[PDB]
Amino acid sequence: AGFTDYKVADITLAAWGRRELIIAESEMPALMGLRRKYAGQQPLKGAKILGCIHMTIQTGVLIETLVALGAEVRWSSCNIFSTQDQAAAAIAAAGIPVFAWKGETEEEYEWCIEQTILKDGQPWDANMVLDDGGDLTEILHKKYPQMLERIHGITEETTTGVHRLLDMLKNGTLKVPAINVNDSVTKSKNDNKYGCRHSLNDAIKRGTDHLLSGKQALVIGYGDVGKGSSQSLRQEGMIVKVAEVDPICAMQACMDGFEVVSPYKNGINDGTEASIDAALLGKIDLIVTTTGNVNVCDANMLKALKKRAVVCNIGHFDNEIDTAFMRKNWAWEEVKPQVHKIHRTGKDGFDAHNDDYLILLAEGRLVNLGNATGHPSRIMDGSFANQVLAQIHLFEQKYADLPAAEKAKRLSVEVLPKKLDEEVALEMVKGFGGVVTQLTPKQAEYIGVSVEGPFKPDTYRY
Amino acid sequence: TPAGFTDYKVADITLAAWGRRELIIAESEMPALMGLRRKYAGQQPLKGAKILGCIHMTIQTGVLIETLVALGAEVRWSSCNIFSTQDQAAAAIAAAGIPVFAWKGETEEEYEWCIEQTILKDGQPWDANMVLDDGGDLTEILHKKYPQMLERIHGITEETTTGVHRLLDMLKNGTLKVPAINVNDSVTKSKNDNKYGCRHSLNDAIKRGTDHLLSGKQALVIGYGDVGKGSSQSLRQEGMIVKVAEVDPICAMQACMDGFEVVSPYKNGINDGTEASIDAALLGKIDLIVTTTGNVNVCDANMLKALKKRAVVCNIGHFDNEIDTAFMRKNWAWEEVKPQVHKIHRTGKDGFDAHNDDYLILLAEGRLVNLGNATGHPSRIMDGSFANQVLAQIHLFEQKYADLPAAEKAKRLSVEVLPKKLDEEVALEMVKGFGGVVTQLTPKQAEYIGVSVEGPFKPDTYRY
Amino acid sequence: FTDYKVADITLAAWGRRELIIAESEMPALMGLRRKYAGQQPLKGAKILGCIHMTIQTGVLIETLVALGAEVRWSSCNIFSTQDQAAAAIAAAGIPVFAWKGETEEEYEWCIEQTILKDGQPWDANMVLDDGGDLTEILHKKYPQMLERIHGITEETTTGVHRLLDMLKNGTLKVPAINVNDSVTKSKNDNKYGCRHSLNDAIKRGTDHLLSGKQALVIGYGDVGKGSSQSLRQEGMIVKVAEVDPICAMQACMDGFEVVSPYKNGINDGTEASIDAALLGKIDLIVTTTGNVNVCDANMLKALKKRAVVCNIGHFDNEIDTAFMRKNWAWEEVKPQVHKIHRTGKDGFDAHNDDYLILLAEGRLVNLGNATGHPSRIMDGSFANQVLAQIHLFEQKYADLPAAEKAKRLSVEVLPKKLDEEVALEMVKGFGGVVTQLTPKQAEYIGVSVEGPFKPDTYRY
Amino acid sequence: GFTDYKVADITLAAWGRRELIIAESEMPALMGLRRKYAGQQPLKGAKILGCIHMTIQTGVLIETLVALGAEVRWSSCNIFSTQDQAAAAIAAAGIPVFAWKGETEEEYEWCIEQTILKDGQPWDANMVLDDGGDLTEILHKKYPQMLERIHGITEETTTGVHRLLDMLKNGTLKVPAINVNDSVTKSKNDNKYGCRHSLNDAIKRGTDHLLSGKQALVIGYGDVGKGSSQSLRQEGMIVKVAEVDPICAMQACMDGFEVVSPYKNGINDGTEASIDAALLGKIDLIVTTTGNVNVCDANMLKALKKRAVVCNIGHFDNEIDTAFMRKNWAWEEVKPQVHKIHRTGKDGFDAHNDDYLILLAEGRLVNLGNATGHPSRIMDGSFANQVLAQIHLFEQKYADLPAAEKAKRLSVEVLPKKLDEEVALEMVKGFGGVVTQLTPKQAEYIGVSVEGPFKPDTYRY
Ligand SMILES: NC(=O)c1ccc[n+]([C@@H]2O[C@H](COP(=O)([O-])OP(=O)(O)OC[C@H]3O[C@@H](n4cnc5c(N)ncnc54)[C@H](O)[C@@H]3O)[C@@H](O)[C@H]2O)c1
Ligand SMILES: NC(=O)c1ccc[n+]([C@@H]2O[C@H](COP(=O)([O-])OP(=O)(O)OC[C@H]3O[C@@H](n4cnc5c(N)ncnc54)[C@H](O)[C@@H]3O)[C@@H](O)[C@H]2O)c1
Ligand SMILES: NC(=O)c1ccc[n+]([C@@H]2O[C@H](COP(=O)([O-])OP(=O)(O)OC[C@H]3O[C@@H](n4cnc5c(N)ncnc54)[C@H](O)[C@@H]3O)[C@@H](O)[C@H]2O)c1
Ligand SMILES: NC(=O)c1ccc[n+]([C@@H]2O[C@H](COP(=O)([O-])OP(=O)(O)OC[C@H]3O[C@@H](n4cnc5c(N)ncnc54)[C@H](O)[C@@H]3O)[C@@H](O)[C@H]2O)c1
Ligand SMILES: N#CCNC(=O)OCc1ccccc1
Ligand SMILES: Nc1ncnc2[nH]cnc12
Ligand SMILES: [K+]
Secondary structure (H helix, E strand, O other): OOOOOOOOOOOOHHHHHHHHHOOOHHHOOHHHHHHHHOOOOOOOOOEEEEEEOOOOOOHHHHHHHHOOOOEEEEEEEOOOOOOHHHHHHHHHHHHOOOEOOOOOOOOHHHHHHHHHHHHOOOEOOOOEEEEEEHHHHHHHHHHHHHHHOOOOOOOEEOOOHHHHHHHHHHOOOOOOOOOEEOOOHHHHHHHHHHHHHHHHHHHHHHHOOOOOOOOOEEEEEHHHHHHHHHHHHHOOEEEEEEEOHHHHHHHHHHHHOOOEEEHHHHHHOOOOOEEEOOOHOOOEEEEEOOOOOOOOHHHHHHHHHOOOEEEEOOOOOOEEOHHHHHHOOOOOEEEOOEEEEEEEEOOOOOOOOOOOOOEEHHOOEHHHHHHHHOOOHHHHHHHHHHHHHHHHHHHHHHHHHHOHHHHHHHHHOOOOOOOHHHHHHHHHHOOOOOOOOOHHHHHHHHHHOOOOOOOOOOOOHH | OOOOOOOEOOOOOOHHHHHHHHHHHOOOOHHHHHHHHHHHHOOOOOOOOEEEEEOOOHHHHHHHHHHHHHOOOOOEEEOOOOOOOHHHHHHHHHHOOOOEEEOOOOHHHHHHHHHHHHOOOOOOEEEEEEEEEEEHHHHHHHHHHHHHHHHHOOOEEEHHHHHHHHHHHHHOOOOOHHHHHHHHHHHHHHHHHHHHHHHHHHHHHHHHHOOOOOHHHHHHEEEHHHHHHHHHHHHHHHOOOEEEEEOOOOHHHHHHOOOOOOOEEHHOOOOOOOOOHEEEHHHHOOOOEOOOOOOOOEEEEHHHHHOOOOOOOEOOOOOOOHEEEHHHHHHHHHEEEEEEEEEEOOOOOOOOOOOOEEEEEHHHHHOOOHHHOOOOOOOHHHHHHHHHHHHHHHHHHHHOOOOHHHHHHHHHOOOOOOHHHHHHHHHHHHHHOOOOOOOOOOOHHHHHHHHOOOOOOOOOOOOO | OOEEEEEOOHHHHHHHHHHHHHHHHOOHHHHHHHOOOOOOOOOOOOEEEEEOOHHHHHEEEEEEEHHHOOEEEEEEOOOOOHHHHHHHHHHHOOEEEOOOOHHHHHHHHHHHHHHEEOOOEEOEEEEEEEEHHHHHHHHOOOOHHHHHHHOOOEEHHHHHHHHHHHHHHHHOOOOOOOOOOOHHHHHHHHHHHHHHHHHHHHHHHHHOOOOEEEEEEEEEHHHHHHHHHHHHHHHHHEOOOOOOOHHHHHHHHOOOOEEEEEEHOOOOOOOOHHHHHHHHOOOOEEEOOOEEEEEEEEHHHHOOOOOOOEEEEOOOOEEHHHHHHHHHHEEEEEEEEEEEOOOOOOOOOOOOOOOOEEHHOOOOOHHHOOOOOOHHHHHHHHHHHHHHHHHHHHHHHHOOOOOHOOOOOOOEEEHHHHHHHHHHHHHHHHHOOOOOHHHHHHHHHEEEEEOOOOOOOOOO | OOOOOOOOOHHHHHHHHHHHHHOOOOOHHHHHHHHHHHOOOOOOEEEEEOOOOOOOOHHHHHHHHHOEEEEEEEEOOOOOOOOOOHHHHHOOOOOOOOOOOOOHHHHHHHHHHHEEEEOEEEOOOOOEEEEOHHHHHHHHHHHHHHOOOOOOOEEOOHHHHHHHHHHHHOOOOOOOOOEOOOOHHHHHHHHHHHHHHHHHHHHHHHHOOOOOOEEEEEEOOHHHHHHHHHHHHHHEEEEEEOOOOHHHHHHHHHHEEOOOOEEHHHOOOOOOHHHHHHHOOOOOOOEEOOOOOOOOOOOHHHHHHOOOOOEEEOOOHEEHHHHHHHOOOOOEEEEEEEEEEEEEOOOOOOOOOOOHHHHHHEHOEHHHHOOOOOOOOHHHHHHHHHHHHHHHHHHHHHHHHHHHHHHOOOOEEEOOOHHHHHHHHHHHHHOOOOOOOOOOHHHHHHOOOOOOOOOOOOOOO
8 A cells, every 4th residue: 555666577467376375375285384383483573684586486485484474576587588577576575675677688687686675775784695506696796795795695596696605705795694504405406407307498499499309409407407408308298408518517417317428529619610510410309508608609610500400508598509699690580489590591580481490498598487487386395495594594604793703704605404404304304294203212213313304425426 | 366265155156247337337338437446547546445334335335345456455355234235246356356244145254244344355354454334243353353453554434324323432432443434424435325226225125125006005114314315205206005104204294295194103192011012903904014213113013013914124224123024033933935025924923824914025024125125226326325335445555544643643633524526526426427418607607606617616514 | 241250250350360379280180172163062062060169170161161151150169269260260251150258048049140140041051060069950950951951970989979879769760970980080189189278277176286286087088098197197196086997907907096086986876985085085087078967066075175166067967056056056267167165055255265176167178277188189080070070962962852861861970091191181280200111011011002991990 | 647748947937936926926917817717718729839938937827827727838939938947837837838938040940849749649639729820831931730620819919910921821821820029008008118128228238338428320219129128228338220111210219319320311322331430439238129120231230330239129030131241250159148249250369359349149039038028017018919819719620621611710809908908907906006087077078988998090109
C-alpha cells in the first residue's frame, strides 16, 4: 500500500508467481526447515542484504526465507535473461525492493544493480552481500568502498564468483570476508551437476524442440557443470563427445563412457584454421560450453560446425562463445525470444530458406536460465539452504565492527563446516522420503566418527 | 629363471606360461605403468630398494611387481587376501625368480605364514627398506612383531581406504614408525579404482559365482562411498532395482539424485538390537545384498534371518566382518556349491535337506567378492592405482627417511598424498590409452582461469 | 482469404520460421515432396484432415498440398494446437480451424467447419484422421458424404481400434489404411516420441525435479515403454502396471518393478482393494493405456499428497477427472496446470497441502503442456500418411462398381518395402550409413539385396 | 551299469546336480509345467532326439521332458557350449547324452550320430528338438526312413527356423515344425535380454578387458544385435552399429547409437579400398550378430586396430572369416577358447608382438563358448515354450495321419498367443511382479477377454 520501490516487467503477474512460490515451498524442505527453525530467534534481525542472483521462483523462496529470519533486502538479477517475471512480480508485490525482468539490456542490468545499492539516491545502509558471479561484489569494490566498510561479509553462489574473490584476496584488494557457498557438497555436487542434468536438455527442447536421440553432441568441459550437461544429453540418447584441458576430468569422461576429443588437431590451439579438426566439427549437431573460461567455442570452430548445429553456453558468462565474431560477420534472424539463426552467408541480409546457419540459444548467455527456468526447486533447495546458513554466520560474526587487528585475522574466503553440509543434505534426503541409517556406538567408534557426524574427513571428495 | 630357484610357494608352477601370456596382454592395457618402465628403467630409481609387498597376487599386481623390479628393486611378495590370488599370476612371478608366497584359497594360518615368508629370508629378517601394503596387514605385523625391522624402512605406500584409516589411527596415536603415502586418495586411484573398478567387477563376480539373471531383481547396496557408488552402478546397469542404505546424508543425497531409493534395514534407521527393529517387509523382497562400507556388521544376524529365501549375500569391502558370517557358521549348515560359493541353509546347524528351499547364497565366504569370485579390477583400471604406487615408492625411497637423525625424523613422520601434478600426469597417460585427446590451454586462457598451461588445473580442495 | 479460424493470425511469420526449421528435421517427408512433385499424385484430392495442429502437422499439410491436394483442417484435441502453426497455415491460404484451449463445443464446431464449405458439404474425397472423431462424425451425421470418399488414413492406435470395430460391425463405409502399424510409425512415434515429450511436458508444467522421486506408469505398450524410459532416464524410480503379462515381462527385463494399484491385481470396486501403501509413495502417475478409468477415484484418493497426475493416452477418461470435478476444488496454477484440493468441493485454502497437480485436465499431456513429438520423429509417421493418402486416392474406391467395392472394403497396412524406404530416409537424416548386402549374403539369408529384409511376421 | 553316454568326466555329476537344483528355483515357468503335467504324463511314448547346448539350463529342460513321460537321447549343437558338469549330471541320471566342451568337428558329428542310432540301428525316435538345424539336416539327408515315424520338430533358434522354411519352400521338409524362436517369451526375451546378460559376461571371462571408454562395433541390430549393443553400452562402451535393414538401423539411431558401415558408402565390393580404414582402426571390439555369412571379412580383419577383440554371438562361426586367419596368420592360444592371431605372418610369431587380434571361442557362439550362455531365469521362457511345443506336436501324431491329411498339416507354425502370455505370467510372478486384472467394463472397452489374449496376432511388442 504505497510501495513503489521496485521495477519489474508486469506487477499483475504477482498472483501467478505467488501460486508458484507456494508450490516451490513444498519442494524446498531444507530452506523451509530453516524458516521454521530460526523464525523465533530472528538471526537476521538488523541484516540489510544486497542480493544479486537470478530472480527466479527459487530465488523468491530464498528471499522470503531471509526476510522471515529478520533481514531486509534489495534485490537484482545476475543475468539479463534469467528472471522469471512472475517471480519478480510476486516479490515486489510483497513489498520487497526488486529490480529485475527477463530480457534486460546491458544498461538496464547495471541500472538494476545500482538501484539496490542506492536508496533515494544515497548509499543504502547495507551490511551484507549475497552474490552470484561477482558482478555486485565488483561494483561495490570499485565504486562504493565506503559501503564495504560497514559490510560484514559476502556469500558467493558460483564457481566463477569464487574465483574472482580469490583473485581479490590474492592481490590484497578484498575488503570483507566471504563464504564460498559453491563448494558445499550440497551445492557444487547437487546444483552444478544435477541441476544442469535437469535443465540443459530442458532449455534445448523449449528453444528448438529438436529430437536429441541419435544426434552428435560436443560438450566443452567436464567439471561439475560439464558432467551434468553430458549426462543431460547422453540420457536423451545423444552421442556425446567431451573436450577437456584437465586430464583427470578427461579420465572421468572416458570411464563414464564418453569419447574424449579436442576441437583442435592434437589439441594444439594455435589460432589458425588449419588447427581445426574440420572433420570432427562437421559432424557435431550440438555444442555446449561448460568451462567458465574464455573463447572455448571460437570463431574457427563456429565456421567449421555442421550446418544447422545448435550452439549454447551453460557457463556463467557469454564469453565462452565468440558471439562477438558472429555479430560482426553473420546475419542474425530471430526465431523467437532467446532463439536466433546465425546465417554464415554474410552480414547484410539473409535468405529466409538459407540452409547454412547455426542456431544460437540465449545469445550465448546461461542457456538453462535463458531458455527454460534454470534448476528445479528441489535442487536449489540445497544451494539456498547453504546461502541462508552462510548469511547467518557472517552477519553474526560482525566483521565490520571488529578492530583493525581482528579484521586482519578474519579476512578470508571460507566454506561452511561439513556438519552443516550434512544437515542440509539430510533435509534433502528426507524430502525424497529417504531413510538414513543411524550408526551404533560401536560402528561409529570403528570408523572414527561421532554418531551424529560429521562422517568424512575434510579431504573427502564424494 | 634363476638356477635352483625355490624361494617361493604357489599353487601350481605349470600355470607359469599361461600367466606370462596374460601379463604380456596386461602390459598393453597398462600404459601409465608401462610408461614409467620405459621412462625410468635407465635411471634405475629403485636400485637398492628392497620392497616387502602385500597386495592381491593378480595379473595386475604382476605387472606392478615387474615394473618395480625393472626400475632396480628387489621384492618379496604375498597376497593381502586368501581368495584374491590368480594362481597363474603367482606362478609366472615365481618362474621369473621373484619370491612370492600366494595361492587362491589359503587358510588364515597359511595367509599369515605367507606374509612371514616375505619378512623372513633364510630364517632371519630380510634387510627390507620399503613396504607396499593393501589393507594394512603387513604394516601391522611389522609394527607388532618385527618392530626392529622398521628401523631400516624408508616408507610405506598404502593402497586402499581401510589401510589408510589404520595408518591415520597409528599416526594420531604415536605408534607409526615410518612415513607413509596415501596412494588411495589420488584421484586416479580413488575415483578410478574404487568406483569404476567395482562397476566392472561386481556384476562380473556375481555372474561367475551364480550365473543369476540380475535384470528385474531387487538389490540392496549398503554404503554409497566410492565402492558403493561403483557397486550400485554395476547392478543398476544390469537392470536391477537397486536400493541404497547409508549413514552419511551427503552420500545418501547423491544416491537419491542418482536415481536410487534410499532405505534402511532398520525401522526409522534405528538398530536397537532387537528383531522387532528389522524392516522385515523390506528385507523379505531383497534378492541380493552387497556390503561396501569398510565398517563392521552392516549386514547383521537379524538382517540375515529376515532376508528373502535364496537371496545372494556378498561383501566387496576390504574385510569380511561387514557381514556376520560368524553367526551363520554357528547356526546354519553350509553346502559348498563350488569354490567360493556356499548355500547356507537356515533350517538348522547339523544336516541340511539337499532340496531345502530356505537358504542364502554366500559368495567368497564374505571376503572381497570381486577378487574372490572373479579377477578383481581390470588392467586398464589398475594401471592408474599402480602407477601411483610406483611413484610413491620412488619418492619415499629417494627420501631415505631411515637414514636421517632422530630430530629430522620427527619432522617427516607423516601420511601424505602425491601432488596433483603427478595425479594429472597419470591421468593423461590413461586418457591417451583410450585414444582421448586432451586440449591444450592457450596462454590467454590459462591466465583467465589462473592456471599454468602445463597444470595443475585445479586447487587442492577440488573434489572432481 | 477468410476461410479459417485461428487464435492470432499475426503469429504467422513466427510459425513460418519454425516450419522452415522443421522441414530441415523431416527428411523423409521432404524427400516425398521432391520425388512426387513432378507426378502430382494428389491432384484432384480434397482431404478432410483432423490431427493436432502442430508445426509438424503443418509440414504434412504443405506436403499434401505440394503434391496437388486441397485440404480443410482441424485439430484432434482441444489443447494440442500450436497457435503459430495454425496461423502460418491459415496465412498460406489453407482452410484451418484450430487453436489451443478450445472448448468441447468449439472443438466440434472446428471439425464441422472443415466438413462444410459455404453452409454446404464440401466435395471431400479423402479423410486423414487421428483418433477417429472425424471418421465417427462423417459416419453418424454426414453418411452421404462418405459416398464420394475414396479412403481414410488413420494415425493412432485408438483410432485404428475404432476402425476395426466398425469393420467387424459392417458399418465402415470406405477403405482405410492403418498408418499406426508401420514400424516407422508405431515403433518410432508411439515409443520414442513419448520418450522425448513426456518428461518435457512435465518439466514445462511443473518444473519439478524428477530424479529421486517415485513414478507409476500405467501400461507398457509402445507409449508406456517410451513414457517409462522418459522418466527412468531422468532418474525417477519407475514402477510399471500392466494387464498384459508379455508386456509386463518386458518391463521386468527392462529393469522395472511391476506392481498393481490393487491388492493382488483385483480391482473389485472397493477402497479396500487399493494398495494404499504403494499409492501413498507415488509422486507421479502417468496413464498410457487407451483404456478407461485406469487411474480411478479410489486411486486418486489414495495418492501421495502433491503427486502429479497426467495422461498421455489419446482420451481423457483414462483418469477419473469427472470424479475430481464433482468432489474436489480446482485451483488453476497456469493454463493446463491445476491444483486439485482434496479438502472439499466448494472453495479451498491457498496454503492447503493436500492437493494433486493435474496436467492438461487429463488430456494428452505431451501435446497439452509441451509441443508433442519432435519433427524428426513425426517425419516417419507423416511420411507414411502421405504414402497412404497417395495409395487410397489412386485406387479411387468411390468410383468402383458395387461388386468391386465389397472386395475392396478393408483396413490394410503399407507394404514393408515402403516402411523400409521411410526408415532409410530417417537413418540418412542422422548421418547413418546402411550396409548393402553382397549377392552371396542376400542368397544366404534368403532376401533380395533390395529388400524387404524381414518377413511380415517380424516384430523388430 | 548304465553306459549309454559319453561325457568329459562323470565325477562332475554331483556338482552338476547342485547347480540343477539352483536352476530349478530360477525357472518357475518350466518347473510349473513339470508340476502341472507330471500326473497326466503327456509325453508318455514320446522318444525325443534333442540337439541343443548341453548347459545346466538344458539339463532342466531334459529332466522336465523326462518327468512328463518322454525318453530322450541328447547331444550339444555346438562344440564349445556344453557345461561338463551339466552333461555329467544328465548321464549320471541314466539319460543318454553325448556332449563335452571342446569337441572336434568329427566328435560333434559322432555325438549326433550316437543319439540317432541305438545299438547300431536307428532309434525308435518320434520327436525332434533342435537348435540350429544340424540334427534336422542329418535326418533329412541320411535317415529319411526315421522321419516317416517322427511327429514333428521343435526348433529353438532363428537360423534353424530359416533352414526349416527353406525346406518347406523346396518341398523337402518331411515333418511339421513348431518355430519356438518366434514366441515373444523366446525371441524378445532369450535373443535380446539373454545376449544382454551373457555377451559382456563372456568377454570379461575371456579377456578381463575393461570395456568402459572403448570403441565397439556391433554388426547387426536384430534381437541379438539389440541385446548385444545394450550389453556393451551399459558397460560404458562407445557402441557403433552396422545394419543392412534400414528399419533396424532406424531403431539403433533412435536408441542412441551411431550407425556406420565397415565399407565406404556401405558398398561391399570386395576390395581393400572399400574398407573404412579410419573407422576400423578405432575399433577395440567387434561382435557379429547376424546369422549371415562373412560379415566380419578378411579386409575388415586386416584393418582392425591392433589388439582388438573379435567375437561372434550368431549361431555359426562363418560370420567371421576365421578360415582366412587360419590360412595366413599365426595362432597363439592364451587359454581355452582365447587365441591371439598374429598378423605378422603364418610361420611362427614373436611372443611380444604387438600386432595381433584376440579371437574368442574360435569364432563360435561367444556367450556359450567363453561363459555359460543365457541365465536360467531367461532360458525358463524359451524352454517352457519347448516343452509346450513338444506336447502339441506329439499329441497331433502327424506320423500316423493318412497321406492326404499329412499334406494339410505339413507346416512351420508358432505357438498360440494365449500360451505365450501364460509363459510370460509365470516369468513375471518369478520376479514378484503383480499383473492387474481388467474389469469387465475395461475388457469390453478395449475388446478383449479378461483372461486374454490381450493383443492381436499382428502386435509387435
Ligand atoms: N548454468 C548453471 O546453472 C550453472 C551452475 C553452476 C555453475 N555454473 C557456471 O558454469 C561454469 C563451470 O562451473 P563448474 O563448477 O563446472 O567449474 P569446474 O571448475 O568444476 O569445471 C570447469 C571445467 O572446464 C574445463 N575447461 C577449462 N577450460 C577449458 C577449455 N579450454 N576446453 C575444455 N575444457 C576446459 C576445466 O578443466 C574444468 O574441469 C562456471 O562459470 C560456473 O559459474 C553455471
Ligand atoms: N573390493 C575392491 O576392489 C575394493 C576397492 C577399493 C576399496 N575397497 C574397500 O571397500 C571399502 C569401502 O571403501 P570406499 O573407498 O568406498 O570408502 P568410503 O569411505 O568412500 O565409503 C564407505 C561408505 O560406507 C558408509 N557406511 C558406513 N557405515 C555404514 C552403515 N552402517 N550403513 C550404511 N552405510 C555405511 C559411509 O558413510 C561411507 O560413505 C573399504 O574397506 C575399502 O578398502 C574394496
Ligand atoms: N500422446 C501421444 O503422443 C500418443 C502417441 C501414440 C499413441 N497414443 C495413444 O496412447 C494410447 C496407447 O497407445 P499404444 O500404441 O501404446 O497402445 P498399446 O496397445 O501398444 O498399449 C496399451 C497398453 O495398455 C495396457 N493396458 C490396458 N489396460 C490396462 C490397465 N487397466 N492397466 C494397465 N495396463 C493396461 C495394455 O495391455 C497395452 O499393453 C492410445 O490411446 C494411443 O492412441 C498417444
Ligand atoms: N548366442 C545366442 O545365445 C543366440 C541367441 C539367439 C539367436 N542367436 C543367433 O543369432 C543370429 C541372429 O538372430 P536374431 O534373432 O538376432 O536374428 P534377426 O533376424 O532378428 O537379426 C539379424 C540381423 O542381422 C542383420 N544383418 C544381416 N546381414 C548383415 C550384414 N551384412 N551387416 C549388418 N547387419 C546384417 C539383419 O538385417 C538382421 O536385422 C542367428 O544366427 C540366431 O540363431 C544366438
Ligand atoms: N500346480 C501347478 C503348476 N502350474 C503352473 O505354475 O503353471 C504352469 C504353466 C507354466 C507355463 C505356462 C503355462 C502353465
Ligand atoms: N544357457 C543356455 N542353455 C541352452 N541354450 C542356450 N542358448 C543360449 N544360452 C543357452
Ligand atoms: K526452475
